[PDB]
Design an enzyme around this catalytic site. Sequence first.
Site, mmCIF file in Angstrom:
data_model
loop_
_atom_site.group_PDB
_atom_site.id
_atom_site.type_symbol
_atom_site.label_atom_id
_atom_site.label_comp_id
_atom_site.label_asym_id
_atom_site.label_seq_id
_atom_site.Cartn_x
_atom_site.Cartn_y
_atom_site.Cartn_z
ATOM 1 N N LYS A 232 1.134 -1.015 -0.199
ATOM 2 C CA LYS A 232 -0.134 -0.090 -0.163
ATOM 3 C C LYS A 232 0.760 0.910 0.223
ATOM 4 O O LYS A 232 0.387 2.585 -0.362
ATOM 5 C CB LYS A 232 -0.644 0.092 0.806
ATOM 6 C CG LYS A 232 -1.477 -0.881 0.995
ATOM 7 C CD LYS A 232 -3.506 -1.136 2.526
ATOM 8 C CE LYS A 232 -3.724 -2.313 2.304
ATOM 9 N NZ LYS A 232 -5.085 -2.389 1.026
ATOM 10 N N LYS B 84 -15.176 4.917 -1.600
ATOM 11 C CA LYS B 84 -15.868 6.046 -0.740
ATOM 12 C C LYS B 84 -15.304 7.278 -0.457
ATOM 13 O O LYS B 84 -15.465 8.593 -0.429
ATOM 14 C CB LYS B 84 -14.787 5.509 1.190
ATOM 15 C CG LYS B 84 -15.804 3.881 1.098
ATOM 16 C CD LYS B 84 -15.128 2.994 2.642
ATOM 17 C CE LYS B 84 -14.815 1.964 2.218
ATOM 18 N NZ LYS B 84 -14.463 1.565 4.009
#
Length: 810
Positions: A548, A654
């Site tokens: 990530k 989101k």
Amino acid sequence: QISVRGLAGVENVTELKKNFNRHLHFTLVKDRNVATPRDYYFALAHTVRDHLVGRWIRTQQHYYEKDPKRIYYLSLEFYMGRTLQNTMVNLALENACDEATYQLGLDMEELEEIEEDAGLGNGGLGRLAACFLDSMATLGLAAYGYGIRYEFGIFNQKICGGWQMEEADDWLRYGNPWEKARPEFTLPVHFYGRVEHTSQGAKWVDTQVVLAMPYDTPVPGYRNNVVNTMRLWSAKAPNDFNLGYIQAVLDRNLAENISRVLYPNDNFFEGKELRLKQEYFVVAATLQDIIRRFKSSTNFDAFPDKVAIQLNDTHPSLAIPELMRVLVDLERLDWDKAWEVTVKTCAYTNHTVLPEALERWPVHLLETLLPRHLQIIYEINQRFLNRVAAAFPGDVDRLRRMSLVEEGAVKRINMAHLCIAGSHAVNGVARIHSEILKKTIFKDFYELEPHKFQNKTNGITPRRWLVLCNPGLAEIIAERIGEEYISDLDQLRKLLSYVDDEAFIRDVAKVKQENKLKFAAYLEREYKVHINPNSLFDVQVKRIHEYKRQLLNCLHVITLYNRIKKEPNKFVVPRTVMIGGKAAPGYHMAKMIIKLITAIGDVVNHDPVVGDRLRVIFLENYRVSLAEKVIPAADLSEQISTAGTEASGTGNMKFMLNGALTIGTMDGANVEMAEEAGEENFFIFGMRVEDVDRLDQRGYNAQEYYDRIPELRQIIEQLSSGFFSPKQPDLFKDIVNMLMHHDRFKVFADYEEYVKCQERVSALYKNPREWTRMVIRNIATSGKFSSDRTIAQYAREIWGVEPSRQRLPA
Ligand SMILES: *Cc1c(COP(=O)(O)O)cnc(C)c1O
């Protein structure tokens, strides 16, 4: 208060108030003189819960009567978060309860903060399952979520001395008002034992028994009166168990430890026996429950017509051989018929290509714990390879590459291979990911059965991720296009015709500013840290992992800091860099990255010259409830995983739905998000999958970047010399070593383009009007990422059922 929150009718506000007092008295056994905020929270929870029961009972009675095909979503994780507000939203009770509690002299928001997060998940995988349940209920599907009721979910993260400290998530401490124990439906699960081959069939005998007790939690659809069920199994020892006397009773713990705690690994396989037990436990109890429900509705030919089992990754992969075991050993079906039923019933969804995350269980483990299942797996492999051999005569390497059994140091079973063989559908979770599956990891399987492979790009539920967490935004949107979009997110495209609307531009920016002020306040309330609400909120929240690349974010932060120190009186767009996420307890590098982040903040946040121009904050205990607060307040969304590693990502969606612009690589769903909004409205940078491959063929040499980029060199030297760790000069030696000699994720390779791209971000932020217009273009095209769309595709293309938006009589 605001439209989308429903009506505050005279009669129902009055009714809510009396039932609230009724529960405070009869249920909590308290009066207004000794009640605490927690008591009030429970009184409200029970009051709302009451509105669910009627619908829950008739929904289930409905499925019994109509007997539609049933969907079973098996997952070891369900990251539900809080349930109170979500329930009010789906039942259109939010304003009424807000009013009722107001009249009772209580602040409902204060009460909602008391509810514990149901954290039965690590992150994206568990959250996806939760969003999926919401969408399935909203789409009128007769679906059931099946998992484990962990006594302890994901650990609560504490930051001490800049280091992560884990503490047990005792989420059931004060009780769970949403669940309903169903001890009457307890089922036995078997472990160990041995296989006996008799005249007619094999028998699994001398097993140790553990009872599975189910707990049902209601899953309400959005204003359609549909309430589905999430059934979670809890481990219970039989009473004759181990039956000195005292010791025998205490050892019941051994059996009940199965459902004690969630393994806190995100994208990492840990081959522990306890984990295997959990996987079989959930599978065994679920399949018996499924079969029992079916036998009610002897010929399993129609089983696939009335049942669909979706495997959330390989964690519940034992469902395939367990189903075979039951059909063959218990129902006495011939192998071929049993296999046909199994394949047509099971569908498998892969969520990652990272080698360290793939499940490969040692044969000796299965041999001891599940002897019959191992035999079935061998038989499945034998027949599967005969098929491969017939399709590719003489291709002996393909045979060994496709085998479910891997040879070597210790023989292991490749659970992914097992899933592909026993499922009629296999899907990736984003277009690029599904393509990578067909081109790399599952290439051989795709060549054998191309028809099985599909794509089902992930999504998020707009109820929790828009209406619930960002009412202000949902409202201004509703004002222009109505409320229909909440269950039809594609309608957000209509907002495109407001991109030049001055009033709307102003409102979008106002809502964001309010969210930032509210969050900036929260930070001082529960954590006591001052931040500038006028700065750009740069946030990266997600589990801490090397792929990530929170480290790439760190390098940029240090770059910004060095540039300010070099030219102090030069103007720079103020930024509040927020990074949050938990690291798996045994993931050393991940824990070091957290320490690095706090270490950076220690220096940057106290440098007089920097002032309020740059702040580095580490958001502690990132979880669903915190996501609901910080995402609506974000300006910049960091989705910077190395191309090809983030199967899909969902946090990215989101942020897009909540008005943040995205800076990211062409990885996972980022590709489709950029495609939907237009690349000109996305901050894309870095290597694409092809570039990464080119670099690997050539050989990745970090030194090259270090030698050609002065700013990068400076950062590494600061890290190595102890600039960020005075008392412990070599504290970050492991980080530097990794970055320089064994960085599997090529952090340095994307550094230059990343920093450059970040400059374009700051440039746009300096123009409020144009930044907001780009935001509008993102929000307006985020419709495709609704889990309703994702679920509709699963329903039509995999499960063979039609979604419905029809209300049930309430
Ligand atoms: C949405 C979510 C995730 C997934 O985030 P990614 O950035 O896709 O990894 C993880 N944790 C929480 C609490 C979430 O709400």
